[PDB]
């Protein structure tokens, strides 16, 4: 017992490579990735024309067990918070039922906190670092190919004040917490992008992250299905066929949030937090945080 865990891995790098290799075998496009030059008329930029097919991508809960002469050590501390000496801990043969969901700014169909809202970051001080948020209760986000995603207005405004009850200041006794939206960047980054029913959705979320804190009203989010996307696997671009179904319908459970904080206002009265995402590793990290691989004889 009395062991160490952190914002490093277990299966973060492993899983990432399994999922990248899983997507490849499943959602086949017509790829285009950039290998950089040298000169003299010789300059690569690989384009690949595969028989772009209309398949359906479905998530299979992936269990990660002990790798060779190693052992998985699950931290049982109900509220383990990232890095630190886990007190209550035990060896396990496999982690748990991890659903590999690829998506941005909103972690979906995953593990919730059993106690209170728990946030985690490598360095809560460096504004450049992603802050992951594990939610208390699940929220629903129903979406369709028809361009929209609606989530309960009350359910989500509540989770916001909960997350607000602990931002950057570090569960700060108090100050003004502000939720604004993305500053800019790729479409996959600026919007809640995810793969719904095989298709790629780009849901405009300004309405989820635009507030201030210290009957059947639903939050309707405009959404768009794009065919040309910037890859998350590696720095590339890809194009998929247009939809064939006229009833693309998903129902996911927001289980988290991946944020970022505005800077140049260190320790002052207000702290702005905007949605984030992009590094799919930060998606595996939210599920694998409580695990670690130790060499066994």
């Amino acid at each position, epitope marked *: 017992t009395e062991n160490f865990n952190m914002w490093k891995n277990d299966m973060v790098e492993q899983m990432h490579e399994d999922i990248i290799s899983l997507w490849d075998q499943s959602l086949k496009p*017509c790829v285009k990735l950039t290998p950089l030059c040298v000169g003299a008329g010789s300059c690569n930029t690989s384009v690949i024309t595969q028989a*772009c097919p209309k398949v359906s991508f479905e998530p299979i809960p992936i269990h990660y067990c002990a790798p060779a002469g190693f052992a998985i050590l699950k931290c049982n501390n109900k509220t383990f918070n990232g890095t630190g000496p886990c007190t209550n801990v035990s060896t396990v043969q496999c982690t748990h039922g991890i659903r590999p969901v690829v998506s941005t700014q909103l972690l979906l169909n995953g593990s919730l906190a059993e106690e209170e809202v728990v946030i985690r970051s490598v360095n809560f001080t460096d504004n450049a670092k992603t802050i992951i948020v594990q939610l208390n209760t699940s929220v629903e986000i129903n979406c369709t190919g028809a361009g929209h995603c609606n989530i309960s207005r009350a359910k989500w405004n509540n989770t916001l004040k909960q997350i607000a009850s602990k931002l950057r200041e570090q569960f700060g006794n108090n100050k003004t917490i502000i939720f604004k939206q993305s500053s800019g960047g790729d*479409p996959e980054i600026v919007t809640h992008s995810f793969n719904c029913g095989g298709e790629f959705f780009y849901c405009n979320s300004t309405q989820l992250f635009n507030s201030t804190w210290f009957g059947s009203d639903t939050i309707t989010l405009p959404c*768009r*299905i*794009k065919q*040309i*996307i910037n890859m998350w696997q590696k720095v590339g671009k890809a*194009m998929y*066929a247009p939809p064939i179904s006229g009833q693309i319908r998903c129902s996911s459970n927001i289980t988290g949030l991946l944020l970022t904080r505005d800077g140049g206002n260190s320790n002052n009265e207000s702290e702005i937090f905007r949605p984030g995402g992009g590094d799919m590793r930060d998606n595996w990290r939210s599920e694998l945080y409580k695990y670690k691989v130790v060499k066994i004889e």
Partner: antibody
Amino acid sequence: QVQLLESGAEVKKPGSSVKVSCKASGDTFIRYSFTWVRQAPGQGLEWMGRIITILDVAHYAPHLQGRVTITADKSTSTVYLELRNLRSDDTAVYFCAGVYEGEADEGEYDNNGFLKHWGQGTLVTVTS
Amino acid sequence: ELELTQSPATLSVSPGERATLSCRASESVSSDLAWYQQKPGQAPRLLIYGASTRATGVPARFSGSGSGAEFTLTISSLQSEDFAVYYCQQYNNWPPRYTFGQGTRLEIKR
């Protein structure tokens, strides 16, 4: 709605390289994909190839592959078709065509295979 | 590798009457069929696409029907403007290997 205008006629000896242009105007060039259709004197239409103007990836017909090349200059809204190793049988009228997809930083792209706009035609005669 | 064929090589119809041309395929094209009209020395005119949807400025006169490997192009009231050769083109396959038919010649019968 684009307006496709092509280069004048070409007279080439067999074995030469020809590059015909197609100035696209009137509509956001990138949001369209251009194809080249050739037509020999008393024959019909023949698909040679098509370029996806947003990605710059062309897919040619399995018979022209190797000696045909389509490019689009996004700064001059100009499509191109180079045909090398000219055989006398390459003597025909080369039309550039196109349809609208919808991209231009939207990610949308139908990849419509049909052709809505065409050009006046460029006669290319190849003879000794 | 889709081989397209338009059945009546030449169709002779009296002006004002109705005309119907067929376009078969060796493999299934699944609705990705088009129809073009070509006057003598003029670039082709896109009449129909997606097997049955007519293009902007194409009279109800012309009609597109069919799926799989057999299509038809009906022109009810044949005017004089409708003198031309008609071509059908499939574009189902990927990578693109879209093909044309050898055309049907639509002339005036007298």
